[PDB]
C-alpha cells in the first residue's frame, strides 16, 4: 500500500523534473503543503497552490526551469523513512552538498531548513535533502 | 549460463545415487 | 536486506581459517625429525626439494622445507620450525630455521646471511 | 646515529644542491655508480620519496626522527608542509648554520654537539634542540677565541641571514624574533610531495 506519502511526494517531484513536466498534481496533505512552502522559499520550485479534487484537496506544484531548459532541482532524497527514522541534534545537523543544498528538518518550532535550525539551536527529524 | 555448470552437479549427484543403490541393503543391516 | 531483517538476524563475518595451526600460536616450534627426503615439485617446476618430516612439541607431525644449498640433518636431529609456505610443494607449510639448534648455517654464504644463519667473515 | 659517508653522492642522486658549494656536483650532476647515466623509469613514488630524502639529508635528520616531525606538523593547526619545514628550521644546528657561524650543516652539528653554544644562559649540546621565540644563543668563553670560530667571525658574507635570525654582536650573538613562515624559509624543495609520501 501507500506507506510514505512524503517519499511519494519527493518521487513525483523527481520524476516530473526528469520528464521536464511543468506541473505536478498530488493528493494534498498539510505536511506536503509545508514542504512545498519551503521549496518555494529556497527557490527550488516556482509556485504551488491548493485546488479541490473529487474527494479531497489537490496540491499543484509548478516546476521551475531556467533559460535553455535547465532544471532548478538537481537532486531529491528521502532521508528519514518509516521505521528507520533519522533524528539530528542541533550540533550534528546534516550538510547537503557541502552546504549548497538544503536539508528539511521537522522541529517543534515547525518545519525549518538546516540553516534556520542551526541558528535557532534546535534539532529534529531530517525529512529530506534537496540540492 | 553454461551447461558446464549443470554438468558438474549432474555427475556428483549421479555417482551419489549409484552409491546409494549399491549400499542400500548394507545401510539397512548396519542401521539396525 | 531491510533494516528489520538486519535487526532480526544481523551481519555474520566470514570465519577466518586458522593458519599455521601446528605452531599452536607460537612463532617457532622445536621438533625432532623422523625422515629427511627429497620431493618433486608441482608439474611446471622440476627439482629435488630437501624436506624433513618433523614431530613438533605441539604433538603434530609436520612436513618442513629445508632452505639453503646444503644441509646436515638426518633422523633424530633437533630443529626449530617456523612458518613458511613453499608454493611448489603440495602440503608443505613450515620451514626449518638455518643456524638454530642442530641445523648448521649454510656454508660459503655472503649475502642474505641473516636468513641462513651464517656468521660474518672476519 | 649519523650519516657520515660521502656527501656529494647524495646530492648527485637527488639532482639538487644540498651543500650548495659543491664543485663535484656541478661536474657530475647525474646519479652515482656504474648505471648513474642510465634512463630511469618515471614513477610518482620515486618523486615523492626523493623530496623526502632531500629534506632529511639536507638537515641531517634520521628517518625515525623525521617521521615524528611529520606527525607533529600534521597535528599542528597550520598546513602540514609549512609546519614541517619550520620545525626543521627551528633546529639549533640549523639556526647556527643560518646565522653563519658554521660553513656546512655538518659543521654546525659538530659545533653544537661538542658544547660550544648556550641558549638563554644554559649550555645545550642537543643538535635537535628546537629554538622558540625570543631565544638568545651565545658562545661560551673558551670557544670564542677558538680558531675555526675566529674564522667564522671574519668569514661573514658566505650566505644571507634570514629576517627571523639576527646576529647582533662581534661575540656572534644570535637572536630569534619568531619562527620562520614559509615565505621566510628558502629551501630547494617541494614540501607538498613529502606530505603526500606519508599519506601513502
Amino acid at each position: 500500500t501507500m506507506t510514505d506519502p512524503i517519499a511519494d511526494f519527493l518521487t513525483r517531484l523527481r520524476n516530473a523534473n526528469s520528464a521536464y513536466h511543468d506541473e505536478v498534481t498530488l493528493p494534498h496533505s498539510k505536511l506536503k503543503a509545508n514542504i512545498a512552502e519551503i521549496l518555494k522559499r529556497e527557490g527550488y520550485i516556482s509556485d504551488y497552490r491548493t485546488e479541490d479534487a473529487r474527494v479531497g484537496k489537490s496540491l499543484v506544484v509548478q516546476l521551475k526551469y531556467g533559460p535553455s531548459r535547465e532544471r532548478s532541482i538537481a537532486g531529491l532524497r528521502r532521508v528519514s523513512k518509516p521505521g528507520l527514522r533519522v533524528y539530528a541534534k542541533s550540533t550534528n545537523l546534516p550538510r547537503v552538498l557541502g552546504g549548497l543544498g538544503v536539508a528539511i528538518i521537522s522541529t517543534s518550532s515547525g518545519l525549518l531548513t538546516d540553516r534556520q535550525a542551526a541558528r535557532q539551536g534546535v534539532g529534529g527529524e531530517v525529512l529530506a535533502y534537496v540540492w | 549460463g553454461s551447461v558446464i555448470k549443470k554438468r558438474r552437479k549432474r555427475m556428483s549427484k549421479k555417482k551419489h545415487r549409484k552409491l546409494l543403490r549399491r549400499t542400500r541393503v548394507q545401510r539397512r543391516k548396519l542401521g539396525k | 536486506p531491510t533494516i528489520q531483517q538486519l535487526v532480526r538476524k544481523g551481519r555474520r563475518d566470514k570465519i577466518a581459517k586458522v593458519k599455521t595451526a601446528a605452531l599452536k600460536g607460537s612463532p617457532q616450534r622445536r621438533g625432532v625429525c623422523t625422515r629427511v627426503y627429497t620431493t618433486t615439485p608441482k608439474k611446471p617446476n622440476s627439482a629435488l626439494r630437501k624436506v624433513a618430516r618433523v614431530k613438533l612439541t605441539s604433538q603434530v607431525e609436520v612436513t618442513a622445507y629445508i632452505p639453503g644449498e646444503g644441509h646436515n640433518l638426518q633422523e633424530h636431529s633437533m630443529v626449530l620450525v617456523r612458518g613458511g609456505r613453499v608454493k611448489d610443494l603440495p602440503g608443505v607449510r613450515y620451514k626449518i630455521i638455518r643456524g638454530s639448534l642442530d641445523t648448521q648455517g649454510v656454508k660459503n654464504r655472503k649475502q642474505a646471511r641473516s636468513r641462513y644463519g651464517a656468521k660474518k667473515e672476519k | 646515529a649519523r650519516y657520515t659517508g660521502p656527501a656529494t653522492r647524495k646530492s648527485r642522486r637527488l639532482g639538487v644542491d644540498l651543500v650548495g658549494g659543491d664543485q663535484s656536483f656541478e661536474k657530475r650532476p647525474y646519479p652515482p655508480g656504474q648505471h648513474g647515466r642510465a634512463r630511469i623509469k618515471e614513477s610518482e613514488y620515486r618523486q615523492q620519496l626523493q623530496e623526502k630524502q632531500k629534506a632529511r639529508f639536507s638537515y641531517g635528520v634520521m628517518e625515525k626522527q623525521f617521521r615524528r616531525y611529520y606527525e607533529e606538523a600534521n597535528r599542528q593547526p597550520g598546513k602540514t608542509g609549512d609546519n614541517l619545514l619550520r620545525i626543521l628550521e627551528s633546529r639549533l644546528d640549523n639556526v647556527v648554520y643560518r646565522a653563519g657561524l658554521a660553513r656546512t650543516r655538518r659543521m654546525a652539528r659538530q659545533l653544537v654537539s661538542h658544547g660550544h653554544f648556550l641558549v638563554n644562559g644554559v649550555k645545550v649540546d642537543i643538535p635537535s634542540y628546537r629554538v622558540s621565540q625570543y631565544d638568545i644563543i651565545d658562545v661560551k668563553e673558551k670557544s670564542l677565541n677558538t680558531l675555526p670560530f675566529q674564522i667564522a667571525r671574519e668569514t661573514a658574507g658566505e650566505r644571507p641571514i634570514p629576517s627571523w635570525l639576527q646576529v647582533v654582536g662581534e661575540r656572534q650573538r644570535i637572536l630569534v624574533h619568531q619562527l620562520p613562515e614559509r615565505a621566510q624559509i628558502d629551501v630547494p624543495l617541494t614540501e607538498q610531495l613529502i606530505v603526500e609520501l606519508y599519506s601513502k
Partner: protein
C-alpha cells in the same frame, strides 16, 4: 604549458589466420593546471603514435572544473562503467590524496587539495571516466545562486565565501605582480 600524464599503456591484439596482430592503446590526460582537463584514448600500431593520438583526443575534450581555491567545491560521487569515484574537498596543505588514475586527472586539473577514493572497478580506463563524471557533477556557488534565484550569501556556507575571497585576492596579487 600543458601537463601531460600517460596513465596506462595496454598491448591489445586481434587474431587472424596468420597469428596475432598486436596493437597498443594509450590513455592520456592533458591539462593546464588551471581547472582545464581533457581525457583522450589513443590506439595505434606503436606506443608513441598511440600516445600522440591520445593527446589530440584529450585536447578535443577539454572541460572546466569548478574550483573554490585549490580545492573542489563540494563532495561528489561519480559513477561510470562500473567505476565509482568519491571526491571530497580538503583544507589547504592536505595534498592530492588519490589513487593512481584519479591522481592523473586531478593533478592535470590543478586540484591541489582533495580526498579521492575509488569504490568500484579498478580498471584504469573506467576509473578515469568515473572521475570525470564526478568532476562534471561539481557545481559553482554562483551557478547554484542563479538557478535558485537567491543571493550568494543565502545559498553558500560562510566559510566557503571566505575561502573564495582569499583565493580572489591571490589572483589579484598575481595580476599585480605580473602586470608590474
Amino acid at each position: 604549458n600543458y601537463i601531460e600524464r600517460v596513465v596506462s599503456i595496454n598491448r591489445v591484439s586481434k587474431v587472424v589466420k596468420g597469428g596475432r596482430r598486436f596493437s597498443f592503446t594509450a590513455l592520456v590526460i592533458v591539462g593546464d593546471g588551471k581547472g582545464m582537463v581533457g581525457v583522450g584514448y589513443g590506439k595505434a600500431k606503436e606506443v608513441p603514435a598511440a600516445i600522440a593520438k591520445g593527446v589530440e583526443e584529450a585536447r578535443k575534450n577539454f572541460f572546466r572544473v569548478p574550483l573554490i581555491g585549490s580545492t573542489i567545491t563540494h563532495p561528489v560521487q561519480g559513477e561510470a562503467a562500473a567505476g565509482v569515484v568519491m571526491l571530497r574537498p580538503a583544507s589547504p596543505g592536505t595534498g592530492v590524496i588519490a589513487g593512481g588514475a584519479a591522481r592523473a586527472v586531478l593533478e592535470c586539473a590543478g586540484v591541489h587539495d582533495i580526498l579521492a577514493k575509488s569504490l568500484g572497478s579498478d580498471n584504469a580506463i573506467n576509473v578515469v571516466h568515473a572521475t570525470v563524471a564526478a568532476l562534471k557533477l561539481l557545481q559553482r556557488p554562483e551557478e547554484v545562486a542563479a538557478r535558485r534565484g537567491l543571493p550568494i550569501e543565502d545559498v553558500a556556507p560562510a566559510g566557503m565565501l571566505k575561502a573564495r575571497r582569499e583565493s580572489e585576492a591571490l589572483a589579484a596579487a598575481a595580476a599585480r605582480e605580473g602586470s608590474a
